[PDB]
Amino acid sequence: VYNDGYDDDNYDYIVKNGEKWMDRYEIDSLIGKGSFGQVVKAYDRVEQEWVAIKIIKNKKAFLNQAQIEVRLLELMNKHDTEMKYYIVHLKRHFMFRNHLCLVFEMLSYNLYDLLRNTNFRGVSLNLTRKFAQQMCTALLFLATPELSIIHCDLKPENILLCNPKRSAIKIVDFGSSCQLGQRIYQYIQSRFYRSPEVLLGMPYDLAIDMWSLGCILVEMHTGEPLFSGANEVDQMNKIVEVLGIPPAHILDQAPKARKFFEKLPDGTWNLKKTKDGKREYKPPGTRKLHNILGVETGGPGGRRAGESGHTVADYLKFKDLILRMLDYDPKTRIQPYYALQHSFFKK
């Protein structure tokens, strides 16, 4: 007996297709689940349109976090009433059978579905550019002083197409977002997309979303995650394979530095000592992004050899942008405004 029979044993509402709510919403089916709860497809009788309804778990901690989501969505939606800045539209919310429900505009496939449809061969560099420009514009929007919003969980699954045959996108899931003042969490971001500062337990700001974006864009074009760690130690090591040891000025201020690294008497840092002649990672900085992207070898896995819009010059620009997004130092990591001016975006 959970919530008088309406809930399962993980605080979720037991969805029933064909159910009608408040003489208004006709529940078609379940679209998906997340840590927050569920999302369903529904027809709104009153407005004569399909909508997506996020059903938050019936548990205080989740309800309370979703209240923050609502505040942030409404705040974004009123600075962006023209819907031109790439953020999902929250139409309204309501409580129902002890669940907070958020009603959103209907959207199409997310970018992971999109990758999956190519069998993980990746999408064209032209399409990757289109997503990147939109995403940087969205981050510019979030960075406006009145908002100062950190999404905190960018990943391909949270970027959706508006229409299945078009390149327009919206960002969803501000369920762990916060504003630059009011930061309340420590372990955040999905692991593959998690920034060094968060891994290191350091204070974080809007620049963590740019880190994530850097990872996403590479994955969109290569078809696989750039840094696919199975836990925090693995994750940090995979980053180090590509970018080398993080600078001393950061590790010196990092509460969790010694979870991954050790400081030599001479004042420099290294990876923690490994056992016994075991070898698991490439040496620091030797896994070059140059090769991962196949800059001079026909793109990822050679698969773009002799296609248009995949020149060496194109790839070099793309690579420069990504490396600026993956700067270890959040003070110098490229910011949305300057990213939008990068040569990768030239008309």
Ligand SMILES: O=C(O)c1nc2ccccc2c2[nH]c3c(I)cccc3c12
């Ligand atoms: O955070 C969300 O709002 C969200 N989370 C999801 C989580 C898992 C699977 C699907 C999800 C999902 N589909 C959506 C559609 I279609 C339109 C608007 C929002 C969403 C959404």
